[PDB]
Amino acid sequence: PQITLWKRPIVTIKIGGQLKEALLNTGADDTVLEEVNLPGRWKPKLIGGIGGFVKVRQYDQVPIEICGHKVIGTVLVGPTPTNVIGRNLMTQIGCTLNF
Amino acid sequence: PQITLWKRPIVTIKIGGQLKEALLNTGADDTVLEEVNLPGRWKPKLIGGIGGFVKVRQYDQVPIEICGHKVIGTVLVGPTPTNVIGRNLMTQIGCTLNF
């Protein structure tokens, strides 16, 4: 599909068997989500943004459905005001910026 | 331009006759630049990012030039890790997300 940006590019995702929505974010290297329930082991990570640093759980190689296509990639889990799909997953469903 | 997201989608941008470069960010509604030499008065603004809320200087109706393409809008100045051009400006180039 071809999304414009007169409003937040928000789309459905499925994570942990659960239906959700997230902002398709080209700003960040990695994906972040609202506290959720997930597979296995995570690493501590510190991301930085606007408003300083925030502590996240790094779940590695996780299965997620974005817009209905399967992707396995890194999901960061932490206190994000909103769910954010990073470049890391966007490139696997052939997302590209068009202008 | 169809641009893939393996890298940061950094493009060239011109303000005040200053060449710099900025992230084509679809996760930011607003355009946020670290410093500019714009000549005078700015307006006090608050945006929230992922790590909290920050003071930033709002400039109305700035002529800016992205990839040669001259467009006009509101250019904040703020504590951003990376120059970010958000959707308010990306719509004026008719830029879209695509997959």
Ligand SMILES: CC(C)CN(C[C@@H](O)[C@H](Cc1ccccc1)NC(=O)O[C@H]1CO[C@H]2OCC[C@H]21)S(=O)(=O)c1ccc(N)cc1
């Ligand atoms: C400036 C960015 C480099 C900061 N981030 C990406 C950015 O998309 C966030 C992502 C984002 C999206 C929605 C809500 C909060 C954060 N948005 C943001 O704060 O940008 C600001 C520009 O204008 C304002 O409009 C919305 C946010 C403000 S980030 O959220 O911190 C970020 C940091 C690390 C990762 N891995 C992924 C994302």
